Amino acid sequence: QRYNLIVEYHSRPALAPPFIIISHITQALLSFIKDLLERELPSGLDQKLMTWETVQKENYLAKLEHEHRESSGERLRYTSSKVQ
Amino acid sequence: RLGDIDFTGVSRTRGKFVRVTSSTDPAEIYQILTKQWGLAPPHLVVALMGGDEVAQLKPWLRDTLRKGLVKAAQSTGAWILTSGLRFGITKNLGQAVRDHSLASTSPKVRVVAIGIAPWNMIQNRDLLLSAKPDHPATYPTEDLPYGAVYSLDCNHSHFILVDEDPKRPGATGEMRVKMLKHISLQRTGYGGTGSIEIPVLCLLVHGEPRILQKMYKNIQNSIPWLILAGSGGVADILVTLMDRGCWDADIVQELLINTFPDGLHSTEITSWTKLIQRILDHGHLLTVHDPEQDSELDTVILKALVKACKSQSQEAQDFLDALKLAVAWNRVDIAKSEIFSGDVQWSAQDLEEVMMEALVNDKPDFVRLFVDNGVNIKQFLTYGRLQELYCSVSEKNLLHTLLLKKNQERQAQLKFRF
Amino acid sequence: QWSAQDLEEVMMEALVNDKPDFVRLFVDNGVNIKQFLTYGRLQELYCSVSEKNLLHTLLLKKNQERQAQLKFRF
């Protein structure tokens, strides 16, 4: 809910009503005459971010597999098979 | 003959290169690598000496090798000397190196994949023949089959393209040997104050008998060698001979014939037998890496380096270079097992510099080890040394910013940083 | 010795029959998904659904709607 509120007040014009009228007039006049979120990145930076995310994903999966190998149950199963 | 290459393909990348002849001095090449291209003197050099054969690595062995090599290299600044041609294990290593380079938060530590390739084996060499200083040459990347001509890997950052020698067709091998020997006689830092000799190491991956002369020359240059257990070629020969423990001419000849049936030349077979015997005669320079058992390439690298150092001599100063390597990689167990095991006498004055290095770089295990091995903190920690410890903060932690604010306040109110 | 062309049919069989372990094995043994997965092959994968899962019924409803509005099953 706080995310929704922050986004809404981010998009909102900067003057509280009844003043709002001024911001709306300004916006309409500029539209007729002429972001922190959802920004698009240059190709190099986009590629670097994709690669960094992939590397982080690989590290996360490796950490999962490692903590699974040294789990108590996996150690016991390995020990039982090896002792047999 | 300096130039730049702008690779065109799936991923755009820029690569530097230099032409060089078999009659050049390796000192010039090292000078241009360090200064002209701005590469810091590496803390570790690993050279790939195989993988160009038709048979290639097993996929699990291949991915374990690349993962281990990258993980070992990421700790410090490492060079990976490969035949920078897009083929075989080289392509996978280049891909892993570039992937790690992109996702590296610290630009200070860099893993550089250098490529030493022959001029005659390059595809579209005339395309890069331009090499305009203002305009880098455009080069297309193509994954050619085995054949006899390949294309330069896009992921290799720098290249050393050597011309074919009119005398013998081994210019690239001789250049590689000379480069490795020259690098082995350099210092890791800009100055020889906190610098070690650069640890040069070669990794063997499914060798063919045509590389035995170069391998023996490298061994004569006294550089460690790493052998993959499951590589396939000469690597299996060597690992089996180590398992046996002794090498006899008949045994090695039988192994050579069984492993490499295509080669049928009595003179060549006898020469290869002699070369294998002479290679195994050293032994201390040879180390086996079995990912099925250890799967920690850094551990095997450190063990090989310390073994070479111990075979060289027993003085504490000789081991000091390996000690700093162990400190750098948090291998307290390996250091304890190899260096700090009875043989080497260790004084308080010897460990002072290493104690400082382990203390600054946040290595508590090594601090504990050094304290237990004669370092007297009462003696060691003077007020000047404490101020030196406070000055050499990481510059990325809270204490650095707080001390910087305090220093700014002191300067505004108004040798050592803090 | 295993080539990419050799494993193509087996890759398709393992992919259709829901064998993730074999898909992982074939990918690691030279099957290049960039090379292997063309749009025609993706449509072939979509056509050969189990006919007992939700996606089959949903695609059947969509196809019935398309036919009512008006080679490969889907």
Curated annotation (Swiss-Prot), chain C:
Disulfide bonds: none annotated. It is found in: Cell membrane. Monovalent cation-selective ion channel activated by intracellular Ca(2+) in a voltage- and temperature-dependent manner. Mediates the transport of Na(+), K(+) and Cs(+) ions equally well. Activated directly by increase in intracellular Ca(2+), but is impermeable to it. The activation mechanism of TRPM5 involves a multistep process. Belongs to the transient receptor (TC 1.A.4) family. LTrpC subfamily. TRPM5 sub-subfamily. Contains two Ca(2+)-binding sites that are allosterically coupled. The binding site in the intracellular domain modulates the voltage dependence and the accessibility of Ca(2+) in the transmembrane domain. Homotetramer. This is Transient receptor potential cation channel subfamily M member 5. The gene is trpm5.
